Symmetry: C3
Subunit: 449 residues, 3 copies
Amino acid sequence: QNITEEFYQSTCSAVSKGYLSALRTGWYTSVITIELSNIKENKCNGTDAKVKLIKQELDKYKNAVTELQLLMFLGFLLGVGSAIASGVAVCKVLHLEGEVNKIKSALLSTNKAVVSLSNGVSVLTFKVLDLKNYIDKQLLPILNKQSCSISNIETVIEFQQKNNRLLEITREFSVNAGVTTPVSTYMLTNSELLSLINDMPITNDQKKLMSNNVQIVRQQSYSIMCIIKEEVLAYVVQLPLYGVIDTPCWKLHTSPLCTTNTKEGSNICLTRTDRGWYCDNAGSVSFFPQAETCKVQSNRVFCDTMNSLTLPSEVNLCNVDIFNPKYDCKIMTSKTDVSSSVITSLGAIVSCYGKTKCTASNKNRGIIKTFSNGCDYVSNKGVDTVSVGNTLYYVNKQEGKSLYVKGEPIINFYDPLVFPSDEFDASISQVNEKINQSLAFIRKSDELL
Amino acid sequence: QNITEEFYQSTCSAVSKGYLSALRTGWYTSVITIELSNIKENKCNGTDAKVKLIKQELDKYKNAVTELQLLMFLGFLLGVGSAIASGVAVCKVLHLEGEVNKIKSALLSTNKAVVSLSNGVSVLTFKVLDLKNYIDKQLLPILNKQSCSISNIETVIEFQQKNNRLLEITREFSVNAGVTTPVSTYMLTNSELLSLINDMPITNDQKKLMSNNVQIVRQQSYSIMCIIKEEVLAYVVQLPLYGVIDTPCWKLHTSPLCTTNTKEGSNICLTRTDRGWYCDNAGSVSFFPQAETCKVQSNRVFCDTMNSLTLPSEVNLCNVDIFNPKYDCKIMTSKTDVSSSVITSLGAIVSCYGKTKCTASNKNRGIIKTFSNGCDYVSNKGVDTVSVGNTLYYVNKQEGKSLYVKGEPIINFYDPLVFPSDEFDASISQVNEKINQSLAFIRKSDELL
Amino acid sequence: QNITEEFYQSTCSAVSKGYLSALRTGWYTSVITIELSNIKENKCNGTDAKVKLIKQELDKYKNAVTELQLLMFLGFLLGVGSAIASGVAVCKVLHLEGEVNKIKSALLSTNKAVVSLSNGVSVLTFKVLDLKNYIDKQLLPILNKQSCSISNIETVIEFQQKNNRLLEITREFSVNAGVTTPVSTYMLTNSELLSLINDMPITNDQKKLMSNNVQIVRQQSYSIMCIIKEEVLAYVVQLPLYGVIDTPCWKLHTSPLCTTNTKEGSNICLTRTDRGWYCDNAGSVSFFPQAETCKVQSNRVFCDTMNSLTLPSEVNLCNVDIFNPKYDCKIMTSKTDVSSSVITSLGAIVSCYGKTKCTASNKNRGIIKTFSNGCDYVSNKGVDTVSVGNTLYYVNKQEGKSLYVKGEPIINFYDPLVFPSDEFDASISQVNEKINQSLAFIRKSDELL
């Protein structure tokens, strides 16, 4: 643990360090067979209510089978790469001539085995439920008669339970237009998922890390509905394969830092655009700009790599002071003055401007601070409430240290009355070049006159 | 009621007035206990089908319990303040030493009571269902034998109903990774929600306003899964606490206003960026830029305050004419000419340009209007259809007045051939300063030459 | 079929042609009645468990009825036109005096008929389920007594099934606050949907195209819960009415194209902002900028027209070379250098810059290509994996041709050290005018000195 956090007032940003990493790098496919049984028609016209119930359940089964048969900041630097592609290839291979027959003929004695398709591939296959014996040898031979009669009541319960399970599966396929995410409990039982993870050919540390957080690995999985033929139903489940384990993985937070003045409209200032998760992998650091693309869960930062960047390992240099001519980190200059507040993982940062009232609070002492102009930092050491203007925020509650590096705002260094403004992706060097060009132009203009 | 609407052609904007307000300002927590019963193993190996069904349902119950055990415009001026924080604190307090034991020992005679945790806090607690008696003195003493036999059939139905309820609850926890929104009917019944609202320590007007719109208050609630131990399951439900009631709360709508010309490419014009809900609270007006953050429901504008602003009470000054040097409201200058149409709460605004065909229609008179160049307003007084180019829109149908303030477009005031363009957050003063600087520069250049 | 694709290296873009089109243009409404039966109270206090189960199910029914009674790039050029408007009008007409009584009195002998409301309108009406005979003729006359007793067990199963269906409907209305999308299997079964489609007053080709893709037409539908009165429940289902069929409909894809250099920071370049679906309709082409607004399904591009443009039919002129002074297509000039990759429908485009490593791969030959600086195109003819930096992408697998039009990047034509940059919607003419103005200004400055 030991989640540390630092706040830098030179740029008015916050960094949170201590989180471990778990980065996915590859997909994995598996075939699930739910083999059905062929039913054609019913002929018996009995009077007893049990026959009517069984016939109604069989009609619901047939309707479900027919329906399933008929079913067959800095954000614009990511890429539109497709998500589900391996499952599509697996389903296309399954659609080929006779491969499903080979799979069915290779799974007659054991419910779990390893089957090889055409070309070259190794995919796990798993069989669920059983409908080739109960409905073929027990109910089918008697219904196709003239005087059917069922002298029992538990068979109805069992049949409706199995039909309810299958109908739930087919309705889940029906509603979501053939693609579902995440996989529900109906599609994959917990024990079956554990068996699949155990049998999946990876190392031991990855198995240990993935088997203790089945919720996360279920959240990021996928399902593809596949060919229906030869009395057997098979679909494809796609499970992520985590590739980067136990590396330092920190977080960044930004907030506007503007100078205060009595004159309205002269509030040029600076802001950062490096939100999201920085993280370490290989030799070049990753980058997740969207904070909603992945979720922190139990001191871990499980995150996809499809929407990520490839920044050099020297990006961790402007977090101390944005002066070094080694790497610039995307200033967000503007000319707006609005109060705001952000709640980082351990503390709170309040940028309070103008005449708006901004105060911290407590559960037993009421008002405890009187935040002045500019941006300030309050730590989780006795406060549980921050009010800004006429809106209220709650502060997170955890255990950790809270440092405070004093400094001086950098906006005061910049001279007003000459300032570019309205740059969405200013990178320090660009704004400095613009300032130098403007100064040279005005100097030449006054010298020549 | 009396939903009035006005259209200003000077800037081509629409204002809708008459809506009452309901602004949330604080959260509230409650603890729900669904206490289970401990089951270890089954030994009887009877042959009767009822025993098999009961054993299967008990196995499903145990698997569910084990799985739950293992489970434990202007948009970038809002703030990233956390949503669920009070529930986290309540769960953390519950996780402390022996508090759950105190809660369980204080809820042995009455199903509803008030319990106080450590430090200082007052949280309501509620008990649902009953599984400490049915499964402990009826099924457990007889299953743990050698010759179990159940000579009844309704017990199976009752047990399957209770197990279905509990398994639905645990599956809905399982699928959504431990956080659900909004709370489903399974988690909180109508009677329990009404009892909690009645017992909530608030005034009478808030209770009257919230008890008649239970759908809205259910939509904005939250649920957190909490500690499992000592044969009792408890989780946290978070219900919003509305704080601002019965204040004027109007709506704004914008549309591009551009001049027409025969020459292609010379279509510099102006647009607004004040979409969303203006509203009144305290002494400084609020602001919700996103129109999808909250929903209008039955002449009310229920809206969260986490994503909101703190604009001064003088913002209602550029809605008449954007000339007064008191407050600027964020021009959106551009150099694009595309036709568009917007459907406000009572009428339609169509900005029709170029050679595209744009016409209103009716259900009994066909074509009724022949909208010319520029932006025009059509009211719901005989029209129910607007076609622009090759796309179709339906107009809302309500009852209210429709005014029309004639004026003159303000783009004609601006002189072309010198115009900044490509400013995302121009604020009238900035564009005027740019124009003045350009005019001064060109004047000096021609004077010195 | 024959999905062809071309890649133009002049601007580094990709075009995919061959897809057929299916464009929606209008809505349609239908009334569904689920007529209930009135129940007031229960008086019999029998001891048998069957009476208890029936009473509990009746109480659940009453609670559900009471709950339902109480329930009574280039993205900012689209428009905020309302989605559900026809259903609102239909419900408002239904709410008028006595129309529901007329509908109920006109549907006493046949379950399907055509009824006309006030003013003028023609809406289909449909009746589902039956609760005016089972519960009012069998259970009500015997429960309202002193010594009720039910000597059967199948009635419980039938009643629980019907009550489960009705409670599922009312719960799904309850959770989603009165508006649901898409319609689940509960509100509309397969046979009823097929009957409604067959009875829909449209041509034959549209019926043939829509009856084979019921998933898509169900995905884009809507459901509005409507007036409750006179012991009859009615709601409105809104089904799309496709209007444009069998027209050419192609797709465009873009990727940054930048020059390479050893000096860091001097990497001015150009990018396109014409993502989404171009498509043909009438005489003016449509435009869908968002790629997530509609889904490709089985060689068809079903897409709503609510969020679309009205571009002239001459837009298909800058796809060959952006030089012709006929139409400009929105350059996205910038000054950033980041590697990226995009996976089009048949191939992959990789823009590889700097020191990052970018390689294609294969399942039987390992590394197969060594992509150099700039942007390159790889086709699906032996590759199934693309790695860029430290991230991995899979390539789509289909059948089709892959052309390659060689050329020269246009950014080499532009002379550096004088270049506007930071224009979000540059349109070739604008950047050329800026360049000409800057050149004229500097020429005058050096001539006068």
